[PDB]
Symmetry: D2
Subunit: 116 residues, 4 copies
Amino acid sequence: CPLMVKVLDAVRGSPAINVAVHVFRKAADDTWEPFASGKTSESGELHGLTTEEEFVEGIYKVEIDTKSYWKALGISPFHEHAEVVFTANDSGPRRYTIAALLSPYSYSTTAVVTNP
Amino acid sequence: CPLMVKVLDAVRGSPAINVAVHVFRKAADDTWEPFASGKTSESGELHGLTTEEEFVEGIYKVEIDTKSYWKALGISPFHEHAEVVFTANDSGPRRYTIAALLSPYSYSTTAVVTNP
Amino acid sequence: CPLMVKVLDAVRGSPAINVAVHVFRKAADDTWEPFASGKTSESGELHGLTTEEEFVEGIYKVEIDTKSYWKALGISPFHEHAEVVFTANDSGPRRYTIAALLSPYSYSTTAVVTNP
Amino acid sequence: CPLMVKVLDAVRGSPAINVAVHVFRKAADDTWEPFASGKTSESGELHGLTTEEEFVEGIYKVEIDTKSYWKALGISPFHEHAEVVFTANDSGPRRYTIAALLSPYSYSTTAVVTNP
Ligand SMILES: Oc1nc(Cl)c(Cl)cc1Cl
Ligand SMILES: Oc1nc(Cl)c(Cl)cc1Cl
Ligand SMILES: Oc1nc(Cl)c(Cl)cc1Cl
Ligand SMILES: Oc1nc(Cl)c(Cl)cc1Cl
Ligand code: NA
Ligand code: NA
């Protein structure tokens, strides 16, 4: 698991379950190419997006579909989604956890980067 | 003012209005002495708490009555209050803004310390 | 202004000054069109981006050049930029403040939407 | 583990290791009685503070010693500590995770409450 996403709900005090996440990687022509996608589990975690072999150097975009999450709960939120954009693996392989804390008009994101 | 407090609501995307705020100063016997208090305005801001003459170096505590705020909106929150404890230092810049961003099960706080 | 952007620095406890901000509007073909831009002032604020006449309903993206900000302080940051994507809706209140709080490996953003 | 504390460092993009945490419980005479203490591990987590039997109903204060953490790293931070104050177990036993994200002039805290 070189790439993991974890999402929490600041209104309910709970993991954010069933949040859709789409990952893109910037291509040689400067467009965002689809790279991996999934949804958070009952623990708010999304595991298994990619592998060490496939997760090469690049600029990645992790799109967290916060609007779909809030609307599936019947609430009207402010943001369309949360985008986390970063260069990965430029000094060799690392393990990345992208965490997000969600409210209807606010979110926070942080990264935990470790060296295996 | 040397000290200003600003409170925001992450659920509704609005200032947090009519929130009670109490400021205390640590006394020599390690107890908290009342220092100043008020309620946030329509902009979420509380001005006029103290003066330069009165705001000497020391340890201060800002207590924000977040539980009453959420209950008046019909929401059951997690925290009893939000407390911000810091040292005022004359070497640093002269004006302190204590900002807090509120959700039912979370809050964040940051200090903006500037010189006019 | 109908749209204002404010950026704060969580490491130094200060406004984030001279941060580049680009605003885009989603066009009918799903591409991002340049809409407005500027640099934050000494207060961390960027005023005057647009007018009521120009700021019609639609999807907007605010891109904050956080990577350049940290590099000019001699700090290597995680994110390429911070992006805030939202729908402007005439039914809601009239003035939007997009606030962001920056650290090298995290950021938060909140929307304060008010009526004068 | 009915009570767990997790702490992250937003400057380093890492767990906050070796953070001291003191938990207090409000006594019948309205004072804060020491309840449990410990320090975060290499994963930023603090396990084993208490037991189901001992973690009765009450108002608890979780004090996270952020100043000692930053100073042990040679940095001068703003806050003395972070205090998280909440009523626990008022509707029967629950499991509580208190999470905190730290920067020198800012912190965020959230709670995850689950029913075993
Ligand atoms: O396990 C976890 N990991 C991270 Cl990174 C956060 Cl922010 C929160 C939790 Cl509970
Ligand atoms: O957590 C926070 N986030 C933002 Cl965006 C602001 Cl302006 C202030 C705080 Cl304390
Ligand atoms: O003036 C301010 N405005 C906003 Cl919107 C935030 Cl989040 C924080 C501050 Cl200090
Ligand atoms: O402010 C915060 N932000 C994030 Cl992303 C997590 Cl996981 C936890 C907290 Cl307290
Ligand atoms: Na390289
Ligand atoms: Na009860």
